[PDB]
Amino acid sequence: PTIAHGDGRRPSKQRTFIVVKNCHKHHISTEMELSMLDLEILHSIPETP
Amino acid sequence: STKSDLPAVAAGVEDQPRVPISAAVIKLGNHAVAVESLQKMYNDTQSPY
């Protein structure tokens, strides 16, 4: 909004802003080293305690 | 008299329905004085207060 001027200094025009807002696309990445000799017993089925 | 002239200057302002309006009321001496700041009206419009 704007105040309508009372005097004849300048015409109290309307105001609208066209603003463009650029987004912040972030990438987060860790690692988790996991040993394959646990994967080998992951794939095997167990039968003994 | 003054009593008979009370509906004279009260041109309708005496019988309007009474609504509450949020305003900060301080007390100076015996009067209540209501304090307000209409600068948020101007800062939206970017007009000099």
PDB file of C-alpha atoms in Angstrom:
ATOM      1  CA  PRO A   1       0.000   0.000   0.000  1.00  0.00           C
ATOM      2  CA  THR A   2       0.910   3.660  -0.231  1.00  0.00           C
ATOM      3  CA  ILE A   3      -0.548   6.818   1.259  1.00  0.00           C
ATOM      4  CA  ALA A   4      -2.692   8.800  -1.125  1.00  0.00           C
ATOM      5  CA  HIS A   5      -1.042  12.222  -1.254  1.00  0.00           C
ATOM      6  CA  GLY A   6      -3.221  15.161  -0.369  1.00  0.00           C
ATOM      7  CA  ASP A   7      -1.193  17.771  -2.185  1.00  0.00           C
ATOM      8  CA  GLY A   8      -0.476  17.948  -5.886  1.00  0.00           C
ATOM      9  CA  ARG A   9       3.223  17.191  -5.558  1.00  0.00           C
ATOM     10  CA  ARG A  10       3.118  13.955  -7.563  1.00  0.00           C
ATOM     11  CA  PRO A  11       0.297  11.517  -8.341  1.00  0.00           C
ATOM     12  CA  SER A  12       0.029   8.875  -5.620  1.00  0.00           C
ATOM     13  CA  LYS A  13       0.291   5.904  -7.957  1.00  0.00           C
ATOM     14  CA  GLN A  14      -0.351   2.297  -7.039  1.00  0.00           C
ATOM     15  CA  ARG A  15       2.609   0.121  -6.079  1.00  0.00           C
ATOM     16  CA  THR A  16       3.168  -3.587  -6.667  1.00  0.00           C
ATOM     17  CA  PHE A  17       6.576  -5.262  -6.649  1.00  0.00           C
ATOM     18  CA  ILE A  18       7.365  -8.315  -8.760  1.00  0.00           C
ATOM     19  CA  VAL A  19      10.145  -9.895  -6.721  1.00  0.00           C
ATOM     20  CA  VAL A  20      11.818 -13.176  -7.658  1.00  0.00           C
ATOM     21  CA  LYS A  21      13.314 -15.224  -4.837  1.00  0.00           C
ATOM     22  CA  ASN A  22      15.917 -17.854  -5.686  1.00  0.00           C
ATOM     23  CA  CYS A  23      15.919 -20.985  -3.538  1.00  0.00           C
ATOM     24  CA  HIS A  24      18.886 -22.588  -1.803  1.00  0.00           C
ATOM     25  CA  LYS A  25      19.252 -26.204  -2.895  1.00  0.00           C
ATOM     26  CA  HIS A  26      21.642 -27.925  -0.488  1.00  0.00           C
ATOM     27  CA  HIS A  27      23.264 -31.351  -0.690  1.00  0.00           C
ATOM     28  CA  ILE A  28      24.253 -33.272   2.440  1.00  0.00           C
ATOM     29  CA  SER A  29      26.266 -36.487   2.199  1.00  0.00           C
ATOM     30  CA  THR A  30      28.012 -38.663   4.785  1.00  0.00           C
ATOM     31  CA  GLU A  31      29.534 -42.104   4.414  1.00  0.00           C
ATOM     32  CA  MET A  32      29.183 -45.354   6.336  1.00  0.00           C
ATOM     33  CA  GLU A  33      31.998 -47.822   5.652  1.00  0.00           C
ATOM     34  CA  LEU A  34      30.619 -51.323   6.229  1.00  0.00           C
ATOM     35  CA  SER A  35      32.847 -54.381   5.943  1.00  0.00           C
ATOM     36  CA  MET A  36      32.064 -57.094   3.399  1.00  0.00           C
ATOM     37  CA  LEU A  37      32.820 -59.938   5.774  1.00  0.00           C
ATOM     38  CA  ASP A  38      29.659 -58.889   7.611  1.00  0.00           C
ATOM     39  CA  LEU A  39      27.856 -58.867   4.243  1.00  0.00           C
ATOM     40  CA  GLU A  40      28.927 -62.460   3.670  1.00  0.00           C
ATOM     41  CA  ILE A  41      27.147 -63.617   6.816  1.00  0.00           C
ATOM     42  CA  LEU A  42      24.268 -61.300   5.941  1.00  0.00           C
ATOM     43  CA  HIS A  43      23.743 -63.317   2.758  1.00  0.00           C
ATOM     44  CA  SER A  44      24.339 -66.706   4.401  1.00  0.00           C
ATOM     45  CA  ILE A  45      21.545 -68.371   6.353  1.00  0.00           C
ATOM     46  CA  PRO A  46      22.499 -69.431   9.912  1.00  0.00           C
ATOM     47  CA  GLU A  47      21.625 -72.758  11.508  1.00  0.00           C
ATOM     48  CA  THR A  48      23.922 -73.089  14.555  1.00  0.00           C
ATOM     49  CA  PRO A  49      23.799 -70.783  17.602  1.00  0.00           C
TER      50      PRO A  49
ATOM     51  CA  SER B   1     -29.477  26.229  28.942  1.00  0.00           C
ATOM     52  CA  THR B   2     -26.500  23.859  28.867  1.00  0.00           C
ATOM     53  CA  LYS B   3     -28.686  20.850  29.680  1.00  0.00           C
ATOM     54  CA  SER B   4     -31.165  21.590  26.898  1.00  0.00           C
ATOM     55  CA  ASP B   5     -28.262  22.144  24.464  1.00  0.00           C
ATOM     56  CA  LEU B   6     -26.819  18.671  24.986  1.00  0.00           C
ATOM     57  CA  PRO B   7     -28.776  17.061  22.092  1.00  0.00           C
ATOM     58  CA  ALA B   8     -27.819  20.107  20.000  1.00  0.00           C
ATOM     59  CA  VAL B   9     -24.081  19.589  19.470  1.00  0.00           C
ATOM     60  CA  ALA B  10     -24.418  15.813  19.908  1.00  0.00           C
ATOM     61  CA  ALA B  11     -25.377  15.281  16.265  1.00  0.00           C
ATOM     62  CA  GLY B  12     -25.708  11.520  16.402  1.00  0.00           C
ATOM     63  CA  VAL B  13     -22.392  10.885  18.192  1.00  0.00           C
ATOM     64  CA  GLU B  14     -24.277  10.320  21.460  1.00  0.00           C
ATOM     65  CA  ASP B  15     -26.293   7.321  20.211  1.00  0.00           C
ATOM     66  CA  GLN B  16     -23.801   5.362  18.199  1.00  0.00           C
ATOM     67  CA  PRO B  17     -23.236   1.752  19.327  1.00  0.00           C
ATOM     68  CA  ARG B  18     -20.179   1.416  21.540  1.00  0.00           C
ATOM     69  CA  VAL B  19     -17.444  -0.973  20.417  1.00  0.00           C
ATOM     70  CA  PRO B  20     -14.127  -1.650  22.182  1.00  0.00           C
ATOM     71  CA  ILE B  21     -10.857  -0.646  20.533  1.00  0.00           C
ATOM     72  CA  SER B  22      -7.464  -1.923  21.685  1.00  0.00           C
ATOM     73  CA  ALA B  23      -5.371   1.030  22.847  1.00  0.00           C
ATOM     74  CA  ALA B  24      -2.727   1.540  25.520  1.00  0.00           C
ATOM     75  CA  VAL B  25      -4.267   3.645  28.303  1.00  0.00           C
ATOM     76  CA  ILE B  26      -2.006   5.420  30.790  1.00  0.00           C
ATOM     77  CA  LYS B  27      -3.030   7.597  33.732  1.00  0.00           C
ATOM     78  CA  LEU B  28      -1.667  11.108  34.282  1.00  0.00           C
ATOM     79  CA  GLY B  29      -2.952  12.704  37.465  1.00  0.00           C
ATOM     80  CA  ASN B  30      -6.660  11.928  37.396  1.00  0.00           C
ATOM     81  CA  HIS B  31      -7.253  11.595  33.648  1.00  0.00           C
ATOM     82  CA  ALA B  32      -6.807   8.517  31.530  1.00  0.00           C
ATOM     83  CA  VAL B  33      -4.809   9.296  28.392  1.00  0.00           C
ATOM     84  CA  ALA B  34      -4.633   6.735  25.590  1.00  0.00           C
ATOM     85  CA  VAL B  35      -1.243   6.493  23.903  1.00  0.00           C
ATOM     86  CA  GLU B  36      -0.702   5.081  20.409  1.00  0.00           C
ATOM     87  CA  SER B  37       1.918   4.956  17.663  1.00  0.00           C
ATOM     88  CA  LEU B  38       0.718   4.881  14.079  1.00  0.00           C
ATOM     89  CA  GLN B  39       4.180   4.453  12.565  1.00  0.00           C
ATOM     90  CA  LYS B  40       3.464   0.929  11.292  1.00  0.00           C
ATOM     91  CA  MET B  41       0.918   2.640   9.058  1.00  0.00           C
ATOM     92  CA  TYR B  42       3.737   4.650   7.496  1.00  0.00           C
ATOM     93  CA  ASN B  43       6.458   2.023   7.299  1.00  0.00           C
ATOM     94  CA  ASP B  44       4.265  -0.240   5.179  1.00  0.00           C
ATOM     95  CA  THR B  45       3.776   2.670   2.768  1.00  0.00           C
ATOM     96  CA  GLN B  46       7.455   3.756   3.004  1.00  0.00           C
ATOM     97  CA  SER B  47       6.168   7.252   3.703  1.00  0.00           C
ATOM     98  CA  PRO B  48       8.097   9.563   6.046  1.00  0.00           C
ATOM     99  CA  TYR B  49       6.440   9.646   9.484  1.00  0.00           C
TER     100      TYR B  49
END
